[PDB]
Design an enzyme around this catalytic site. Structure first.
Site, short mmCIF file in Angstrom:
data_model
loop_
_atom_site.label_atom_id
_atom_site.label_comp_id
_atom_site.label_asym_id
_atom_site.label_seq_id
_atom_site.Cartn_x
_atom_site.Cartn_y
_atom_site.Cartn_z
N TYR B 93 39.66 37.94 38.50
CA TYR B 93 39.15 36.67 38.00
C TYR B 93 38.79 36.69 36.52
O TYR B 93 38.58 35.64 35.91
CB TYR B 93 37.95 36.19 38.83
CG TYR B 93 38.35 35.69 40.20
CD1 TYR B 93 39.21 34.60 40.34
CD2 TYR B 93 37.91 36.34 41.37
CE1 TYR B 93 39.64 34.17 41.60
CE2 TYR B 93 38.34 35.92 42.64
CZ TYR B 93 39.22 34.83 42.74
OH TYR B 93 39.70 34.42 43.98
N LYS B 232 27.50 20.50 30.29
CA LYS B 232 27.87 21.27 29.10
C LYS B 232 29.07 20.67 28.35
O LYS B 232 29.16 20.81 27.13
CB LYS B 232 28.18 22.74 29.45
CG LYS B 232 29.58 22.98 30.00
CD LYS B 232 29.90 24.47 30.07
CE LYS B 232 31.34 24.73 30.55
NZ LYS B 232 32.42 24.19 29.64
#
Ligand SMILES: [Mg+2]
Ligand SMILES: [Mg+2]
EC number: 4.2.3.6
Lengths: 350, 354
Positions: B93, B232
């Protein structure tokens, strides 16, 4: 066994502008034979005969359905392209009909792949060996799309064997499986041979086409296949049926959700591409009408069994139907004897 | 809406946390620290190797930050799998996270992709060279079916990054584009399938449940991430494309209308995840329950999502949602708020230099 098929179809054929396909019986016959001929010779080779465990009568039928599907839908591509695409989509249709368990032959898939060793599963053995003949017609991006969709499709057929329609309340399941075995990105990217389209110049329009076409194609097929997948359902699972099982709804609600999607899909297809690169629109438009034509004529969908039953009506549904239907048979209805010969088993014998 | 819909965000968030049954666990901080360090350490020694340092063109700092965020995501969400499996998924990942830093066109490196794969020759694109070379370490924890899901999803992800290099949000009217792109870069089937190591689960016996989990987890995960990330990215003029931003451009709707779409979908997926798995195999529902909580805890604790900003802003307020949110937040931190100095060491750069 409804009759709603009327409004669904007309709205479908008028939405995409089903003004028949783009060929002349002469041209259709021309392509059908060249395609069938090369594919027929391919599947008749000893190696293909040994690894592809398929009943001849069925391989013969499968090949003829696909060549039809391809020649009628990928109208703007070369003769070689239609032929190579016919070989590939014939392999997929044959897999869809297998009952052998992939599991044991998939245990060392990645390690053999990474190492360049022939895959244990005979289907992978053949398709991967043949794949370059399909990929030579395309750029790297489109190729990646053909490779992924075919890998997805293989998992789809794997899952489709458990004949599972989904857990009640598993709302994301139906479409999950349908995209998995719909060859949507394969079909949508094979519409752009590098020979006539530049993959970098039309990256965005091609991407958009793959995204939108994936749903149009699968949905329209599920639609045309309703009158088929019920008149003889064999413990069958299908997008429509899985909606019922998972969304916990009725068959009418199901087949309504689908029809609403197909219409919206068709609507946005025209809205987005109508004013884009004319050549792109042209390919897209030929596929839609051709894919429809192919569905109306191919035995596999027995859409013939709904002709006369509405050829003596005077409405805005059962009438605007045959007005179209007939158009299909005017170019779509072509006797196999004019192109599908000799039979595969015959070339295999020699 | 030059202003962030705080109230709306707080409400939807709490509804999400309740819908999934966010709550305490037998997964202690001392256990997390043990896992966090173990996963980091193995991964850090991996990316510090010269071959990996040569081929993987990434700023050292950003590599350090990407690894620490991924180790946190894995360790906290894949709580039921082995330490080794956590380490290996961590390496995988992080590779996928780093690929988004690339700007280089894949086109020339993909022209002979299939022929090289079929022949077993090292791939031309250096990312594929590393990722496929290291894949077996990940795949060993799984059976054939789950493995195939890991392989496809990563391939999809590569195409996803390729497409994103065009910074294209879709053509006005292209309604199917947004979700198409988000599934392409979501790693949905990678995540969903990696939740079932063959060491504690049997694909064949649990095929129907694993398959269903993949199909459902794919959308839960990507939508929960888009949601928790909405804060964000709201003010980030650098991130031009996202599921919500594309809903806006492709569907020709407002940001609020788009945001509404995400939340409706998010909560419904959450409701159905619970409804569907609560009555199935206990072990499955547990792995499934831990991933959702873990995943959420991660979003709340990683400074990257800057949610502590929303906390520190409503920490003092009597409204219901506000208090429920902070309660969930403070809840997360107690087991999530762990200083990097307790596990993320030494730095990759240091191991690399040696
Ligand atoms: Mg099948
Ligand atoms: Mg973004």
């Amino acid at each position: 066994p409804t009759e709603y098929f009327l409004n669904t179809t007309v709205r479908l054929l008028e939405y995409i502008r089903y003004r028949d396909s783009n060929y002349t019986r002469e041209e259709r016959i021309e392509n059908l034979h060249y395609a069938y001929n090369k594919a027929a010779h391919h599947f008749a080779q000893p190696r293909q005969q040994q690894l592809l465990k398929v009943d001849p009568k069925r391989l013969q039928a499968s090949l003829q359905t696909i060549v039809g599907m391809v020649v009628y839908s990928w109208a703007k591509v070369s003769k070689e392209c239609m032929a190579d695409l016919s070989i590939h989509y014939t392999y997929t249709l044959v897999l869809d009909d297998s009952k052998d368990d992939p599991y044991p032959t998939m245990v060392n898939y990645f390690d053999d792949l990474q190492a360049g060793r022939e895959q244990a599963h005979p289907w992978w053995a053949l398709v991967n060996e043949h794949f370059p003949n399909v990929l030579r017609h395309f750029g790297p991006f489109c190729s990646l799309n053909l490779i992924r969709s075919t890998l997805d499709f293989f998992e789809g057929c794997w899952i489709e064997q458990y004949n599972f329609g989904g857990f009640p309340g598993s709302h994301d399941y139906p479409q999950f499986l349908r995209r998995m075995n719909g060859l949507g990105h394969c079909v949508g990217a094979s519409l752009w041979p590098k020979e006539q389209f530049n993959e970098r110049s039309l990256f965005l329009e091609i991407t958009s086409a793959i995204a939108q076409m994936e749903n149009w194609m699968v949905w329209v097929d599920d639609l045309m296949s309703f009158y088929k997948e019920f008149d003889d359902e064999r413990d069958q699972i299908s997008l429509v049926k899985n909606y019922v099982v998972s969304d916990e709804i009725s068959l009418h609600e199901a087949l309504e959700k689908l029809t609403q999607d197909t219409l919206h899909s068709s609507k946005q297809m025209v809205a987005v591409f109508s004013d884009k690169d004319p050549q792109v629109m042209d390919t897209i438009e030929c596929f839609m009408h051709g894919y429809v034509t192919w569905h109306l004529c191919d035995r596999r969908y027995r859409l013939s069994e709904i002709y006369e039953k509405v050829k003596e009506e005077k409405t805005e549904d059962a009438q605007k139907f045959c007005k179209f239907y007939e158009q299909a048979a005017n170019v779509g209805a072509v006797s196999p004897s004019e192109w599908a010969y000799p039979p595969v088993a015959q070339l295999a014998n020699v």
